[PDB]
């Protein structure tokens, strides 16, 4: 179960920005952070993990400095590289239990990442990224501080998280299914609805006829999922919650 620290920064123009962030421990989000929040919010009653309260404020301080620095830094890179607003940078940090990773992307395209002891640009990255790397790699303290978090802190943290709040992580929920009629493409449209399951992994097919179109896995407000399987002309469902019990629904 990887811990993904995400971040979306939007820069409308030179003088309008917002940077919001979140954290996914596996398929379940564990933290939240908005541009208009001076702190980081705790969603689940165990988002502090096993880290002390005299150390959780250290992470709080670090990200505060990072946020205001990152915003000014991109604003300045925009001047240097003549980049034209708007700009959209995402940042996908994180690790697992222990290789880590730190990928940043510009306008939805990978431009660089933190491999090794510094910043290394991506394969199909534009030429002007070399300019960014050349300057990012001047800051010595920042380069080691990422290491201090990626190679040591983050792996020790996810350990603390996965312990404090594991009941909610191995939590099983049995779903429910129903069949419906979809808009006729003399062809008809059989639709096998599935909703409420947990965790995300699932297998639903129209058994198996080589024409089943199992749709995407859509989320529900209660941290569960929803699946819509269709067929153009029974329906079988296997899940971890319902052990061995394959939810076969007969038509009609």
């Amino acid at each position, epitope marked *: 179960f990887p811990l993904r620290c995400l971040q979306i920064s939007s820069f409308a123009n030179s003088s309008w920005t917002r940077t919001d962030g979140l954290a996914w421990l596996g398929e379940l989000q564990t933290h939240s952070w908005s541009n208009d929040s001076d702190t980081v919010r705790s969603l689940k009653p165990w988002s502090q993990g096993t880290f002390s309260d005299q150390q959780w404020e250290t992470l709080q301080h670090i990200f505060r400095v990072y946020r205001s620095s990152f915003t000014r830094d991109v604003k300045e890179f925009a001047k240097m590289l003549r980049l034209s607003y708007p700009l959209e940078l995402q940042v996908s940090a994180g690790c697992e239990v222990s290789n880590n990773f730190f990928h940043v992307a510009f306008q939805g395209k990978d431009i660089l990442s933190f491999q090794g002891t510094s910043w290394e640009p991506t394969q199909e990255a534009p030429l002007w990224v070399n300019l960014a790397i050349q300057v990012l790699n001047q*800051d010595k*303290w920042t380069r080691e501080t990422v290491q201090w978090l990626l190679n040591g802190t983050c792996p020790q943290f996810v350990s603390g998280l996965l312990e404090s709040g594991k009941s909610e992580l191995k939590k099983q929920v049995k779903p429910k299914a129903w069949l419906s009629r979809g808009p006729s493409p003399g062809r008809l449209l059989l639709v096998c609805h599935v909703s409420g399951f947990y965790p995300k992994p699932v297998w639903v097919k129209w058994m198996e006829q080589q024409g089943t179109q199992p749709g995407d896995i859509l989320p529900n407000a209660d941290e569960t999922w929803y699946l819509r399987a269709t067929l153009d002309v029974s329906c079988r469902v296997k899940h971890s919650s319902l052990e061995g019990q394959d939810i076969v629904l007969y038509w009609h």
Partner: T-cell receptor, first 114, second 113 residues
Framework: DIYQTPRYLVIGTGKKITLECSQT?????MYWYQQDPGMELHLIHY???????EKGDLSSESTVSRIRTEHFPLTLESARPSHTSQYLC??????????????FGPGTRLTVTE | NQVEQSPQSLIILEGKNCTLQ??????????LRWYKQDTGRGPVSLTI?????NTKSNGRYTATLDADTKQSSLHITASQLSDSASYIC?????????????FGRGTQLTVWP
């Protein structure tokens, strides 16, 4: 390794003044300051490298042109009795330690007359 | 003005040592320099320190760095006539060349016989 010529420069008004600032070491970061005798240092121009030229603190009529890494000339479109000051050039770059320090140019005193 | 710097000007006799101050409210803090500017010449970097340090020496010059109370002072030892100059204290806010530089107005030092 940052030079400035000339050290002194008297010119008439209305004309165009052009201040030479050069460097040997391959630093991409250079600055332009203005200082009045007794006062402090105000940023008027800086540069992250070639073709990059930015306006600093004070909005001066001065303009700069970074076309070569080693050069950073400053230009006044039209002199005036208030544009009489001293102009210092600077440059950031990796020094003896692992930090990026600033070396200052010798300086150029300017006097505009009528 | 984020970098204050006291005293404004002062006049001391030769042979004595004085202590010039420099209080900054710049954050985040990476490094801090001290420059010596003769009347008519350009700034010549005396020292440069980061928050982990708190004492560097350039022979007769010894700046300290109180990184916790955000101040730093230059201690001119055995001040001779040649030390009459301006003393400028500038703080950078990054560890690269992507930062801003914050210059204090400086301290004017006069040394008499």
């Amino acid at each position: 390794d940052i030079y400035q010529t000339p050290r002194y420069l008297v010119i008439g008004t209305g004309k165009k003044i052009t201040l030479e600032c050069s460097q040997t070491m391959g630093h991409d970061k250079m600055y332009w300051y203005q200082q009045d005798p007794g006062m402090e240092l105000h940023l008027i121009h800086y540069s992250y490298g070639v073709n990059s030229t930015e306006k600093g603190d004070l909005s001066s009529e001065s303009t700069v042109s970074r076309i070569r890494t080693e050069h950073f000339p400053l230009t006044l479109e039209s002199a005036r009795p208030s544009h009489t000051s001293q102009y210092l050039c600077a440059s950031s770059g990796l020094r003896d330690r692992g930090l990026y320090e600033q070396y200052f140019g010798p300086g150029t005193r300017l006097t505009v007359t009528e | 003005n984020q970098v204050e710097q006291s005293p404004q000007s002062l006049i001391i006799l030769e042979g004595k040592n004085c202590t010039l101050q420099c209080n900054y409210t710049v954050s985040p803090f990476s490094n801090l320099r001290w420059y010596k500017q003769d009347t008519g010449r350009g700034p010549v970097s005396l020292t440069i320190m980061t928050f982990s340090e708190n004492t560097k020496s350039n022979g007769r010059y010894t700046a300290t760095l109180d990184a916790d109370t955000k101040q730093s002072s230059l201690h001119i030892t055995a001040s001779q006539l040649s030390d009459s100059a301006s003393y400028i204290c500038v703080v950078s806010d990054r560890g690269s060349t992507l930062g801003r530089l914050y210059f204090g107005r400086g301290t004017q030092l006069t040394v008499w016989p």
